[PDB]
Amino acid sequence: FVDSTFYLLLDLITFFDEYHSGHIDRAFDIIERLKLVPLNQESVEERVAAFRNFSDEIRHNLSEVLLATMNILFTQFKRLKGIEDRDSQLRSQARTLITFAGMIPYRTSGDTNARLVQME
Amino acid sequence: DAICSKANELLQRSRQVRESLKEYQKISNQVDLSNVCAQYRQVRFYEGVVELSLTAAEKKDPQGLGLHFYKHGEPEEDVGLQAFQERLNSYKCITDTLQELVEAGHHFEQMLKLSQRLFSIALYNWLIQVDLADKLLQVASPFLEPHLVRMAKRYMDLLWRYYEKNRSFSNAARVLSRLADMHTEISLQQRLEYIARAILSA
């Protein structure tokens, strides 16, 4: 258990290194790997069920996990210029993430200013 | 009559070649305007033409008679139907012109940024037919909010529009709830998706 949290913290850190310094695409891939945040469907709630269970160390970290996601998600999905462009994904991801954030704002520091980054 | 002929000439000189535009504004009225409108467009006068059409619509009606007519919505003379039928023709002209535009923005904002609650309601109705409805979310107009509200009960699209429209959580949730409760066939999966959404807004 102790080691597991350890690796998670390291993974999150590598995500940080690559978050900024560009590499928007890479950040999403890694964050998803964490298996903390709902990329799939409305499984956002399962992410609720598995949230309280979370160890104290991680439970604290989630705030940044979200908003990192809505950032890369934003910047990467800068509306492009002028073909296959599936904007839909990396869009659904924000949606699931927001539902997630919506469900646990009380158990979070109190910055659903995801909204600011969310829109434009 | 003669005045109308003069107006056509007024524009006609303008067809050949700011002033004639102004001269037209003075003259503007009725059906002959339709032909005349095509002429205004020739020298890319879309924006001015819309205000033109709108002002004309208001000029005949002054004012607000049609609104009363709609309230009753009676086929009888009620307030007089004639005003309503007349304006719609002008409105259709405005919409017809809008379509031709497709410097797009300057033309549109003019229409929206005008004070005419039948016009905007009509515009929206025009937009829905086009399936322009998503664009509707964008429209800032103060007229828009009442439009959605009144229309609220393929209205579902209007409502999908509405809850989305409400940035505010409370208002959005109240709508989805009604959406779920609603008597039009909507699958439970959606009914629940509405609730899942509505609940999230908690």
Curated annotation (Swiss-Prot), chain A:
Family statement drawn from the similarity comment of this UniProt entry: Belongs to the nucleoporin interacting component (NIC) family.
Name of the protein in its database record: Nuclear pore complex protein Nup93
Connected disease: Nephrotic syndrome 12: A form of nephrotic syndrome, a renal disease clinically characterized by severe proteinuria, resulting in complications such as hypoalbuminemia, hyperlipidemia and edema. Kidney biopsies show non-specific histologic changes such as focal segmental glomerulosclerosis and diffuse mesangial proliferation. Some affected individuals have an inherited steroid-resistant form and progress to end-stage renal failure. NPHS12 inheritance is autosomal recessive.
Subunit structure comment from the entry: Part of the nuclear pore complex (NPC). Component of the p62 complex, a complex composed of NUP62 and NUP54. Forms a complex with NUP35, NUP155, NUP205 and lamin B; the interaction with NUP35 is direct. Does not interact with TPR. Interacts with SMAD4 and IPO7; translocates SMAD4 to the nucleus through the NPC upon BMP7 stimulation resulting in activation of SMAD4 signaling. (Microbial infection) Interacts with SARS-CoV translation inhibitor nsp1; this interaction may disrupt nuclear pore function.
Gene designation per UniProt: NUP93
Biological role: Plays a role in the nuclear pore complex (NPC) assembly and/or maintenance. May anchor nucleoporins, but not NUP153 and TPR, to the NPC. During renal development, regulates podocyte migration and proliferation through SMAD4 signaling.
Subcellular location: Nucleus membrane; Nucleus, Nuclear pore complex; Nucleus envelope
Top-level taxon of origin: Eukaryota
Covered residues, full protein: 684 to 815 of 819
From Swiss-Prot, chain B:
Top-rank taxon: Eukaryota
Tissue: Expressed in all tissues tested, including heart, brain, placenta, lung, liver, skeletal muscle, kidney and pancreas.
Location of this chain's protein in the cell: Nucleus, Nuclear pore complex; Nucleus membrane
Entry PTM: Phosphorylated. Phosphorylation and dephosphorylation may be important for the function of NUP155 and may play a role in the reversible disassembly of the nuclear pore complex during mitosis. Disulfide-linked to NUP62. The inner channel of the NPC has a different redox environment from the cytoplasm and allows the formation of interchain disulfide bonds between some nucleoporins, the significant increase of these linkages upon oxidative stress reduces the permeability of the NPC.
Residue positions where Phosphoserine is found in the record: S141
Signal peptide: none
Subunit organization: Interacts with GLE1. Able to form a heterotrimer with GLE1 and NUP42 in vitro. Forms a complex with NUP35, NUP93, NUP205 and lamin B.
Family membership: Belongs to the non-repetitive/WGA-negative nucleoporin family.
Pathological condition linked to this protein in its record: Atrial fibrillation, familial, 15: A familial form of atrial fibrillation, a common sustained cardiac rhythm disturbance. Atrial fibrillation is characterized by disorganized atrial electrical activity and ineffective atrial contraction promoting blood stasis in the atria and reduces ventricular filling. It can result in palpitations, syncope, thromboembolic stroke, and congestive heart failure.
Its biological purpose: Essential component of nuclear pore complex. Could be essessential for embryogenesis. Nucleoporins may be involved both in binding and translocating proteins during nucleocytoplasmic transport.
The name this protein goes by in its record: Nuclear pore complex protein Nup155
Species: Homo sapiens
Residues shown, of full length: 871 to 1125 of 1391
